[PDB]
Each structure stands twice: as structure tokens, then as C-alpha cells.
């Protein structure tokens, strides 16, 4: 009967602080390790850390020194804080729970929905349309609609590109 849901899917820039709050509905906060996990296409599934109701945390050694988990028992919440986020932390963040006791055979239960968090890496630019089909070179906010289509490309500079084969281009923020 215990269900978990986190905050809405936000988006952050580089060198900032990430913040997600999970809310438990039903059940108590005692005798349960409230964990945090993330899932990325580059590295697969990964564990971040858990907090017990007395405040005893246990972070992952890879992310130690830039992670912080706090518990708020009275309002039935627990939060995750990530410090100095880079462009390689674009992942779907889950929340789970573990029974108190031995962790040799323990598996994560009561998973969350999963809120996608992306990192912009400080990029904002208007469209650039080149003729060939048609090719769009650089645009940040994904507003494009090609009318007279291959999906976008995660370039290393933080900008997106697609192309279409067989025109009019659209850009909602720049009004292009």
C-alpha cells in the first residue's frame, strides 16, 4: 500500500545544485532504508545512497563528497542534493526502499515513477537552417517542426541537429 512519487521533472544548468524530494504515501518511516537510484543510458543502473530514520546516511563511494541525503520524518519526505552537477548526470532518477536488516539478499522494492532530469551545459541559441533535403544545425529548446524526419543529435557542444528528406522551419522561443 506504500507508494512513492517524487517532484516534477526539472532541468538544471552546469555547476548548480540538484534537488529532488520524494513523498511517501501510507505506512511509517521506521525500519526502512529509503534509497535513491538513477538510470542512465551511458552507465546503466546505479545506486546513490540511502538514509535511515535516525539520520545515519550511507552514500556511494563514487559519488561521495558531492551528494547529500536528508530525511524529514514529520511531513513524510526525504530529499536528495547533488553538488556540482556536470553534463554527464542526465539520467532518470528513481526512489526505492529496503527492509531493515541484512543487505546480503536485499532487493529494492516500492519503486517510483521516475522523473527525467537533464543538464543543459549552459546552451541557448537560435536556429540555423542550411539547404542540401534540409538540415538544421544548432538549436537548444527542441521547438523544431519541419514541413515541406530523423530525430535529434546530442552533440558535444550542447546543441541539437536533425535533417529531413523527401521547406518551412519553426522555432517557438525565437519566433523564427
Amino acid at each position: 500500500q506504500v507508494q512513492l512519487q517524487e517532484s516534477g521533472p526539472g532541468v538544471v544548468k552546469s555547476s548548480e545544485t540538484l534537488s529532488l524530494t520524494c513523498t511517501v504515501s501510507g505506512g511509517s518511516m521506521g525500519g526502512t532504508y529509503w534509497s535513491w537510484l538513477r538510470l542512465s543510458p551511458g552507465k546503466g543502473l546505479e545506486w546513490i545512497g540511502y538514509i535511515f530514520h535516525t539520520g545515519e546516511t550511507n552514500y556511494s563511494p563514487s559519488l561521495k563528497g558531492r551528494v547529500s541525503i536528508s530525511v524529514d520524518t514529520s511531513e513524510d519526505q526525504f530529499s536528495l542534493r547533488l553538488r556540482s552537477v556536470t553534463a554527464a548526470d542526465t539520467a532518470v532518477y528513481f526512489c526505492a526502499s529496503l527492509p531493515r536488516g541484512q543487505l546480503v539478499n536485499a532487493y529494492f522494492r516500492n519503486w517510483g515513477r521516475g522523473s527525467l532530469v537533464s543538464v543543459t551545459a549552459a546552451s541557448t541559441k537560435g536556429p540555423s537552417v542550411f539547404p542540401l533535403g534540409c538540415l538544421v544545425k544548432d538549436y537548444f529548446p527542441e521547438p523544431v517542426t519541419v514541413s515541406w524526419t530523423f530525430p535529434a543529435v546530442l552533440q558535444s557542444s550542447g546543441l541539437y541537429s536533425l535533417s529531413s528528406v523527401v521547406c518551412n522551419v519553426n522555432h517557438k522561443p525565437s519566433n523564427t
Partner: protein, 440 residues
């Protein structure tokens, strides 16, 4: 044949009731019934009674009794609500031995005075496990649970030393004692003896090693609810005791800080001499012999060829993965990974490092804690290890290796090793029987 009515027949049925206690402190033995020394135990000769130590209500009644008896001794004690302030903590580097490095923090903070319009700047030595940084030469700190609850300091005039208590039975009820020396917890007993009240149960709190308490008679006994299932704990009872020796080598000082009218907070002053970590000792040969006897007894259930292994704990919190007790009023946490590390193919000492907390959260209640006051001088401790709580890791229906790790967590399994030979019944004195006799 006619119906004949008899009153007072020896017929009992299983039932439950509220058992009152007796005694020969937190446990508050001044208000209990005194115990009269009398030949209270007699023998029932040709009877067999079904026992079950895993479905006994007395281990669920006595847990609630200890919980309700524990928190009423905190009501005439000071609550540390004004202490949740900002702490300016500093590392101590006064004759450390490179093991207790960074464990103690020298924190100075503002505190109220008995006069309401004055303030004082005091200082204390807090452990690392009781302080949490907030600004993620001096850094700002705070207590570990002032975001959760402000909790009562334990008064210095009461003691946490356990004393034996007896559990009597009310009128119309009886307590039957299991006198079989080869009892395994569940099953019928061919030697059942009634008794007026139980023996002395000492309410010693522990998590991995059953300190003090009663021993076995013939040999080491293994008790479980279901030995095939790996999700249920295994209680081991020894026949000979293994002696442990506590130590806190630091010479602490306690100073009183007045935080209000008639209320005092006991802080930690400076430490005379060097700072050394706490440790516990155990003999190597006696522990090796006891582990050999436990391995010999464990091969009766899991095959007579399997390689019994041991490994250290795998818990998450500090009360499960680390052996915890109290001695002299200070709560210890023993690493105990040097004991359970061996494999068994078919005057040296082991030193176990320790850690000490002060913000104590007993009985796993939400939003309640305790501040343990410091103890002046060194602290000594002699105890008997008369039991273990093991947990098995099983991922094969047929296997040649088994790994046993120490358990813990739930406090209820400590008193199930003392109330396994007792049960409560209700006497029903009415009965009818046919006999060739009739009224007028």
C-alpha cells in the same frame, strides 16, 4: 449411568492474561510485589504438554512492559530543548593515537543562564556520530536529530544496570515449566512441572551476542522457527560461558552547565592524559572451542559434509551491523568482525575496536531519543557471552557451503531465549462424568 458434577478437577486450557511481576532503577522494583522464598516448584508425573516458543504471548507482553517501564523513568528528568543551537566545532589534537583521530569534536556554543536576560559561552566535547554539518578554522555544526526531536537527558541518579525480575501468574492461572534438557523450542515435552513464578530474567539489551543470562545444561542447542527458511533467525545457546572484557581508557570529566532554574546539562570537560580508543577483549582458544562446538552442532541439520563458514555482518544501521550494549552508563558499539571469520572443512586475545554514541534511540520509536550523560573516570566490565543470533545466506536447494552472519535488529529475540521453557494456562475446575449414583 447418571451425570455427576465435580468441582476442582485438574483440567487446563491454553489462554492469555496480564501477568504481574515480582522482585527480590529504570525498572522500578520498589513498587513491585516482594518474593517469598518457598518450595514453589512441584512435579507433574505422567503428563505431556505442547510448547511453542515462537507463538508465546509473554515475549510480546514483556516487550510492551519494558517499553512502558522505560519511558516513565524519563518523565522526572530534564528535557534538552534549549540546546538545539549552532555549534562552532574544532578538531582536537591533544595526544591522539592515530585511531581516535577526528572522532572527538571540540564544540563551543551559546547557552542560556538561569537569569532569563543573560547568556553564557560554554564548550563541550562531542563525538563525531552525534554532530552533523550544515554548511555543506571552524565549521558550523548541529546535533544529529534536533531537526527531528528534542529529547530528555537521562538523570544521573538512576542506573541502567539490569536486575533480575520474576513474572508471577494471577489467580486461576498456572505457569508450566519445561524440564526437558534436550528441548528445541517446539514440540511436546514429557517432563512438565508447574511453578508459581518464573526465575530471574535479566533485561540485558544487546544485538549480536547474548550477554549474561542463563546457559544450557548438556550441550549447545540450536533453536529456530523453521530451519530450512533463511529469512528467520537462529538462536544458539552455549553450555560454557565465554568471558568478555570491556574497556574505555579515556579519563573523562563531567561538568554541570546551568541552562535554567533547577535544570542542568552535563557536558564533557577535558581529558587527562592521552586519548585512546575503546576496545573489548576475548580469549582466542575458548572462542575457537565454542565455535567448533557450534559447527559440530550445526552439521546435524544442514548435512554431515557441508563446509560451515562465518562472515561479518551486513546491516545498514549501526545497531544491526555492530555489537551494541551498555556498561557503566555508556553505550558501546563493538565492530566484532574478528570473531566471525573462519571456514570449517569436514593466552592470545582478540581486540575488537569500539565506538561510543550519546544520542541514543532505543526501541526504534519515531521521534524519541535520549542524551546519555558522561561518566567520570575509566569504565570496566566483565560479562558472559551465553548466546549468538545467526542468520543464514541460502541460495541453493542442495549446497556444500553455508555462510552464517550475525543477526540483530528486533529486540524481542533476546527475551525469547529466556521464556522458551514457560507457558501460561487457564485452570477450568468444572467437569462432568458418568457414575452409577443418583439424587433423591
Amino acid at each position: 449411568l447418571w451425570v455427576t458434577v465435580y468441582y476442582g478437577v485438574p483440567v487446563w486450557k491454553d489462554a492469555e492474561t496480564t501477568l504481574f511481576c515480582a522482585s527480590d532503577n529504570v525498572w522500578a522494583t520498589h513498587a513491585c510485589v516482594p518474593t517469598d522464598p518457598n518450595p514453589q516448584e512441584i512435579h507433574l508425573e505422567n503428563v505431556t504438554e505442547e510448547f511453542n516458543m515462537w507463538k508465546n504471548n509473554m515475549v510480546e507482553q514483556m516487550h510492551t512492559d519494558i517499553i512502558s517501564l522505560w519511558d516513565q523513568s524519563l518523565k522526572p528528568c530534564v528535557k534538552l530543548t534549549p540546546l538545539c543551537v549552532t555549534l562552532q566545532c574544532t578538531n582536537v589534537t591533544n595526544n591522539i593515537t592515530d585511531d581516535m583521530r577526528g572522532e572527538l569534536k571540540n564544540c563551543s556554543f551559546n547557552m542560556t543562564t538561569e537569569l532569563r536576560d543573560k547568556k553564557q559561552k560554554v564548550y563541550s566535547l562531542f563525538y563525531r556520530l552525534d554532530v552533523v554539518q550544515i554548511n555543506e578554522s571552524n565549521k558550523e555544526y548541529r546535533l544529529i536529530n534536533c531537526n527531528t526531536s528534542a529529547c530528555t537527558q537521562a538523570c544521573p541518579k538512576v542506573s541502567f544496570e539490569p536486575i533480575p525480575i520474576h513474572y508471577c501468574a494471577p489467580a486461576g492461572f498456572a505457569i508450566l515449566k519445561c524440564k526437558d534438557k534436550k528441548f528445541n523450542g517446539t514440540g511436546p515435552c514429557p517432563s512438565v512441572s508447574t511453578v508459581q513464578c518464573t526465575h530471574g530474567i535479566k533485561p540485558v539489551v544487546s544485538t549480536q551476542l547474548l550477554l549474561n543470562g542463563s546457559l544450557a545444561e548438556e550441550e549447545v542447542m540450536i533453536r529456530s522457527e523453521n530451519i530450512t527458511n533463511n529469512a528467520k533467525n537462529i538462536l544458539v545457546q552455549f553450555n560454557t560461558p565465554v568471558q568478555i572484557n570491556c574497556t574505555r581508557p579515556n579519563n573523562n570529566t563531567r561538568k554541570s552547565i546551568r541552562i535554567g532554574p533547577g535544570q542542568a546539562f552535563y557536558a564533557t570537560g577535558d581529558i587527562i592524559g592521552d586519548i585512546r580508543q575503546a576496545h573489548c577483549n576475548v580469549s582466542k582458544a575458548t572462542w575457537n572451542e565454542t565455535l567448533g562446538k557450534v559447527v559440530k552442532q550445526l552439521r546435524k541439520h544442514f548435512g554431515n559434509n557441508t563446509i560451515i563458514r562465518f562472515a561479518n555482518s551486513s546491516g545498514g544501521d549501526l545497531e544491526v551491523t555492530t555489537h551494541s550494549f551498555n556498561c557503566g552508563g555508556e553505550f558501546f558499539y563493538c565492530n566484532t568482525s574478528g570473531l566471525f571469520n573462519s571456514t570449517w572443512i569436514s593466552n592470545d586475545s582478540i581486540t575488537l575496536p569500539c565506538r561510543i554514541k550519546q544520542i541514543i534511540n532505543m526501541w526504534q520509536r519515531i521521534g524519541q531519543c535520549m542524551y546519555a550523560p558522561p561518566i567520570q573516570g575509566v569504565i570496566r566490565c566483565v560479562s558472559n557471552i551465553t548466546g549468538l543470533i545467526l542468520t543464514r545466506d541460502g541460495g541453493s536447494t542442495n549446497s556444500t557451503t553455508e555462510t552464517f552472519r550475525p543477526g540483530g535488529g528486533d529486540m524481542r529475540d533476546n527475551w525469547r531465549s529466556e521464556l522458551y521453557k514457560y507457558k501460561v494456562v487457564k485452570i477450568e475446575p468444572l467437569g462432568v462424568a458418568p457414575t452409577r449414583c443418583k439424587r433423591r
